[PDB]
Symmetry: D3
Subunit: 105 residues, 6 copies
C-alpha cells in the first residue's frame, strides 16, 4: 500500500479522501480523478502537496480552471507514485466542459 509511517499514511489518506469528497461534490462524473488521487502511493508526496492540490468547494468553476491537475509539469511530481497521471489534464478538460455546460444549459 501507501509508503510512509503509520502517522503519515493516516494523514495522507485523510487528505486524499477529503479531496475526493470535494471533487465528488461537484455533481458530474469525476471517477477518473478520484481513482488517480486514490492511486497516489507515497504519503510524503500527498502531505507535501496537500495545499497545492486542494480543491475549493466555493467557486467550483475557478477551482476546476485553476487546479494544478491541469498542468503536466505539476503532475510530474506524481509520476513515480501514482497511476494515470498522463491522462489527468485531458480528464480535467472533459470535466470542465461537462460541468460548464451543465451550469450554462
Amino acid at each position: 500500500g501507501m509508503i510512509g509511517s503509520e502517522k503519515q499514511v493516516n494523514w495522507a489518506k485523510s487528505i486524499i479522501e477529503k479531496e475526493v469528497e470535494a471533487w465528488e461534490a461537484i455533481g458530474v462524473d469525476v471517477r477518473e480523478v478520484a481513482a488517480f488521487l486514490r492511486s497516489i502511493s507515497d504519503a510524503r508526496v500527498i502531505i507535501d502537496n496537500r495545499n497545492l492540490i486542494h480543491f475549493q468547494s466555493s467557486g467550483i468553476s475557478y477551482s476546476l480552471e485553476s487546479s494544478p491537475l491541469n498542468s503536466p509539469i505539476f503532475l510530474r511530481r506524481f509520476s513515480a507514485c501514482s497511476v494515470g497521471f498522463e491522462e489527468i489534464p485531458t480528464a480535467l478538460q472533459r470535466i470542465r466542459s461537462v460541468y460548464t455546460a451543465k451550469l450554462l444549459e
Copy 2:
C-alpha cells in the same frame, strides 16, 4: 428498456436506427456514436429531438461539423437518459479528423 408508451418506444427506436444508419453510411468508425444513440433510454426525449439530431447524408462534412452532438450544452438534455455523453464531443472531433483525412488523402 426505453421508457414510454409502446407507440413512443416504437417511434423512438425507428428514429435511433435511422440515425445510426446515417452515421454508419459515412464509412469510418462511428461505433461510439452509434452506441451513444442506442443508449438513449427515454422515448420522449428521442422523439422531441428527432429533427435537431438528424444527420444529413447529403453533405457529410457539414453534417459532422454542424451536428449538435458537437455541443456539450445540447448533450445535457441526454444526461439522465443515456450513457457516454461526456465523451461524445471528443468522439465527433476524432471522427471529423478521420473522415476529413480520408477525403483529402
Copy 3:
C-alpha cells in the same frame, strides 16, 4: 457597396442591423463579428441565410456554441462577399471563452 435590387438591399441591411444588435446585446466585445456581418456585400446571400445565421437572445450560451459562424464550412458561403471570414471561428472561440468566464465568475 451592397449588390442586389433596391428592395433586397434594404431588406438585407435591416437583417444585418438586427443581427448586429443581437450580438451586441450579449455585453462582451463582439466588434469583430459586427464588422464581419456589416462587411457582407451581397444582399441575396444575406437574405437566403437570414434564418440560418440568426442569433437568439433567449439562450445566449447555446446561441454562441451552436452558431454556424463557428463552422469554416458554413462560412465558405461568404468567402466571395465579405471581409474577415477566415478569423471568425477563432473570434467565436474567444467570445465564447470570455462570455462563459463572465457568467461563471
Copy 4:
C-alpha cells in the same frame, strides 16, 4: 490614468514594473503581456492581486503554465480596468509554445 490614493498608485505602479521585468527576463516576446499589465488602471486591484499574479523567475516553464493569466475566469477581475484581457489566454498559449520550443530545440 490610474485611480487610487497617491500611496496606492505608487505601490501599484512599482508592482507592475516588477512583474513586467519578470516577464521580460524570460527572453521571448512578451510585449502583449507587458502592455496588458501596464494597462491596468485600478491601483487597488493591482495591490490586491500582487501575489496571485506574481511571476517567479526560479521556474519559468511552470510559472508560465500555472500563471492565472491563463484563466479567463481569473482575468474577469481586470475586465473593467484594463485593455486586452480577452486575448491574454491566447497570448500565454503562444508564449508558452515559443519558450518551450526554444528550450527544447
Copy 5:
C-alpha cells in the same frame, strides 16, 4: 499474420522492432504507439514507409513534434492494414505533453 513474402515479412518485422525500440527509448509511456506499429499487417506498406516513419533518437522533442504519426492524412495509408490509427494523433499529443513536461520540470 503479416502479408508478404518471407523476405518482406522478415524485413518489415525488423523495421517495426527498430522503431518500437526508438519510441521505447524515450522513457515515457508509448505502449499505444508500440501496439499500433506492431499491428501493421502488410509488409509492403511497412517497407515502403520505413524512412518516412523513422523516429530519430537524436532530438526526441523534434522527432515527436514532426513525426508523420501526428498527421491523420499520412495515417490513412495504414487504414486497411493496422489497428488503432484513428487514435494515434491523440496519442502523440499526450506523449508530447508528457515528455515535454518531464524535460521542463
Copy 6:
C-alpha cells in the same frame, strides 16, 4: 537587408520567390506566410533549409498538414533572422482550416 555573399543572396531570394509562389497557388489567403518567408534575412539559413521547407503543389492538403512551418521547434532556426515566426503555427492552423473547408464545402 539580406546577409550573405552576392551569390548566396541571389540564390536565397529565388528560393523564397519559388516558395511564395507555391503557397500563393493554393488559392486562399496566405499573405502572412508570404510575408514571413520574405522577412527571412539570412541567405545561408534559407539555402540550408530550401528542401526542408519546400511546399509541394502535388498534394496541397498534405503539404499544409506536414509542413515544418507547423512546428515551433523547427521555426526556432528563423528566430534570429525573420519577423513573425511566433504566429506562423497559428497561421498554418487557420490556413489549413480555411483550405480544408473550401475543398469539403
